[model samples]
Target: GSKTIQEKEQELKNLKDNVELERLKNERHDHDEEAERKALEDKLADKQEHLDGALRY
Candidate 1:
């Protein structure tokens, strides 16, 4: 089967859109993981500070 130039262009546009969408999704996922990791680190730091204070007694 043969496609017209317009059809081919449209197909290319669709492919580009899909790739962009996947990239955005991956970026968002990475951002969320980073945030969670930061939160965990903060929590650990707080606990360590508390432990150090207790040990000073």
Candidate 2:
């Protein structure tokens, strides 16, 4: 029995491309999570300052 070599090669190449694309997406997602965490921390700090101001008065 003969196999379709080109067809198999194309499939492998497509899978590799998808893997690379997903890796890039994962990196972007990680960066977004980090940014969100920082924003939350900043909000907490700002609110703490406001609370301290109220206590001072």
Candidate 3:
């Protein structure tokens, strides 16, 4: 079905948007001086991995 490609492309677009959200979250985390730096970095690291995985597909 033609809708199938449109659906998949939509999902890919969704993933890209989510990655943008994760980056914003990461930036906010950077400003939270009370939290541990490594934890914040790890959070972003996991998010980056997710984005990378999505992009790979």
Candidate 4:
């Protein structure tokens, strides 16, 4: 049940990539970029929250 270390690492890496891609897309100044950026930022925070909670075990 403690294998979360592996999963957490993978998820963190995925989040990093998603954020990087979002940054690239943001350069285009698209109409929905702000909305998408906020959504992505929220998602990143939420994911980290869960990861931290899991690590507390």
Candidate 5:
């Protein structure tokens, strides 16, 4: 079944929040910030890749 438009909207919102969290890491600059930023960047990249794959169907 096709997804409801609201579900898609929620998906986008979640992705936006994830990206925003990565952005917030810029200010923290804690000891593991480098590793944390790298991990968050990878997570966001993987999320976008997954979304692209889904959209292609």
Candidate 6:
């Protein structure tokens, strides 16, 4: 009943790294969303190339 060893240490490390990555991704996504919302509010033309030709107005 003792975990004084390297048992599951790899798994633990992997889980921690994944959580950190998720947090970072969430932060980045939030920033992007905020920028996009601001652009939309200003009625700016779509800056992303994917939206090109999607509309002519």
lDDT of 1: 0.63
Question: What's model 3's lDDT at 6?
Answer: 62
Clashing pairs in 3: none
Per-residue lDDT for 15 in model 6?
Answer: 33
lDDT of 2 by residue, 1-57 (tens): 136465666557633666447646744453577768878977876765466556674
lDDT by residue (2-28, candidate 5, tens digit) is: 565667765576345676676666565
Model 4 ranges with Cα > 4 A deviation: 1-30, 49-57
Candidate 3 per-residue lDDT, tens place, 1-57, comes to 765676677557643666557556744434666557757887876765466566784
> Which order, best to worst by TM-score?
2, 1, 4, 5, 3, 6
- The estimated TM-scores of all candidates read 0.31, 0.32, 0.24, 0.30, 0.30, 0.23
Error of 3 at 36 (Å): 0.5
lDDT at residue 37 of model 1 (Cα atoms): 87
Model 6 off-target regions past 4 Å? 1-30, 44-57
TM-score of 1: 0.31
**Candidate 2 off by > 4 Å:** 1-30, 49-57
**Residues 1-57, candidate 1, lDDT per residue (tens digit)?**
465465776667633566447645744453477768878977876765466656674
Residue 1 displacement (Å), model 5: 60
**Model 4, 1-57: lDDT tens per residue?**
675576766667633566567656735544886778889977877765466566673
The TM-score obtained by model 6 is 0.23
| Tens-digit lDDT track of model 6 for 1-57 | 355655767547633566447645744453476767766955754454545654543
lDDT score of residue 39 within candidate 5: 93
